[PDB]
Amino acid sequence: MLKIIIPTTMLLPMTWMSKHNMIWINATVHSLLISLISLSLLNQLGENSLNFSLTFFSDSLSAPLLVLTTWLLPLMLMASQSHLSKETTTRKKLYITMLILLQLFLIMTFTATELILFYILFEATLVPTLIIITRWGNQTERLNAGLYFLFYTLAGSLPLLVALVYIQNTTGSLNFLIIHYWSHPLSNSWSNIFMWLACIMAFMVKMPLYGLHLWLPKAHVEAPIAGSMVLAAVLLKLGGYGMMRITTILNPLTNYMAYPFLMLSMWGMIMTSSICLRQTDLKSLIAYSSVSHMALVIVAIMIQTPWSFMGATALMIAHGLTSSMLFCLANTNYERVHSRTMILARGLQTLLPLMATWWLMASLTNLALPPSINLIGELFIITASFSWSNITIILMGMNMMITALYSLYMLITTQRGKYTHHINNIKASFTRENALMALHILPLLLLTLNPKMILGPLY
Amino acid sequence: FSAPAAYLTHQQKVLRLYKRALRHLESWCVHRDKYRYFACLMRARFDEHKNEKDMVKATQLLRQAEEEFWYGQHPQPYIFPESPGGTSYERYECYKVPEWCLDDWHPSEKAMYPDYFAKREQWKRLRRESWEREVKQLQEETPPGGPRTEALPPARKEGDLPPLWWHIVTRPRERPM
Amino acid sequence: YTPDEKLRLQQLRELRRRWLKDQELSPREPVLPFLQDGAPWKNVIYKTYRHSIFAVTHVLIPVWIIHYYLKYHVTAKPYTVVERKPRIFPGDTILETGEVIPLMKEFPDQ
């Protein structure tokens, strides 16, 4: 696995020792090369995981996420080139290094074989994120947003540390393979209930469960574009990956302990989609849409059926791509009008035609249009939940309807109508932004030809 | 359009009702001969009490007509195509590109319309020079406590253009295509 | 109209008409200066040639490709092209032959 870790580390001295006219170019070149190399990790075996060594391993769950991170880093660089153009060279290098450290930490989380190493790195991801959100954010709310995010994550994760150490002491090991083979049923005692909670709430905070989701809108709104990109694409899927990894040792107590979280997510999807129906900030609308989409992944993980896990993996990948692209489009609009108000700039379908097509395709993917992987994941989760209980279909259908409603409402409000008269600074879209949207969309559409790659280890 | 007023007089409101009544009558009486017959009868009613001088009674005359009009109002009155509520309302709004978008063209694009862009720059020069006069002129004619109506002054002297003219003059046409 | 309103409207009308007349193309608009429109398309046949090359490139190549895919796929994998069994009436078959006519009643009327 070091074939990906070592170049990621070498990115730092490269950027630090590169000329001020070549940081972005070199970073993009070698991040894209790293993604190309990490594409080799998709050759997963049917039954056994790829055990590179004692410390790192990868299965059909880790590989798609690793590829997504290695692919998203260049996209973040391209999106963050614009506003970080008048910054000094040292701060640009610092921002690039923060992004690289975040990517490295994400890789080592998705490849870790030890639960405690996974925890260490998955909590280490906070520091680069928090710095990015509180240092290069534009608003004055970036300070409160960073605190909310950091403290929600830590208050969720510290009991997870306690529980992991307790499990290490009792079972003797935290290795995923051993903890999977030497698995044992959990009794219905209060101690097991609280161990289950300690293991679950940490990831429930990460992928925002309805009620613990208040940090996501602040974090996604106040952070810069690249920060929002990671937070939406990978930092939310961290919780899902952790939950899918740890649910092995949390049975059969889950059957009875999942009801509160299942109900919370199945109602919060509707609540957050309705909130999206009545949002005035584009980034806030996208963040609440992300909450609504991750509610389905939470449900799928808490049901623990093979179709649910496949749908969860597919939805994670698809939602990461779609949310990142939506945030990039909103960033372009913001950099054009210097405001995040949705109703401020209207009739953009007549001034930026290709950007309108990008918005249309992104919204279609967001509302789970067949045969996109978004729909593949959503339909798999819906079938799994229907098998779990037939009543679930009502909430699932209502959520789908409201998602289509608010996505098309965003499309109509932004890229339709009469152009805003007074706004005169809307210049023709650059090649960089269009290339960013194309690099967001094309892998997403291509994955529908080979959906088996992102369907998880249970395919 | 034209600048509105703070209120509509009893004369204005009666005329407004009259046009609505005839247009709704046209919608009801589809046949042209049929409409013309009842148009004079409608005209007679608006002339039965035209000379009424009691404004209290005159207002009461208006009130009864509006209640009669609303109850007899056509549920689906005829609307002109290029009118609010019409089938062709705002149909070409997606083609009305504002003029400032031309400044963002590539030089190669501008090289294909040299005569137009050259004449366009002359229009820009006119706006740039005349703007100081318009700023000056507005301040003079404006009452001290700002304006109280949306009506704008014309060009009082020679070598001057009506203040705030650019958008009204360089507005997109109805069929930009 | 008040006199100021009428005068302003007249001046705006003059400026608007001047602008509209300005919005008129000259006798030419320079188009940038076509190997495929040279020797291949000097005055190539705008009839049979076009209506045959379109037919080729739109039906003949696709039908060849699809039929070849229906050599790559149909007999290389079972239960891929399943045809409904042809209806069998009191008539002769092909490979095995044979027939059984049914016993018939008789009603010439209607």
């Binding site: 007549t350 001034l351 930026l352 035609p353 023709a428 879209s429 650059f430 090649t431 | 590109v97 504002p98 003029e99 978008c101 031309l102 963002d104 063209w105 590539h106 190669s108 694009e109 319309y113 137009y116 997109p172 930009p176 295509m177 | 919005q23 008129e24 193309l25």
Partner: peptide, 12 residues
């Protein structure tokens, strides 16, 4: 009379 058509920049 051929009238100039006001369009956004399509070159980019």
């Amino acid at each position: 009379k051929r009238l100039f058509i006001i369009k956004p920049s399509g070159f980019y």
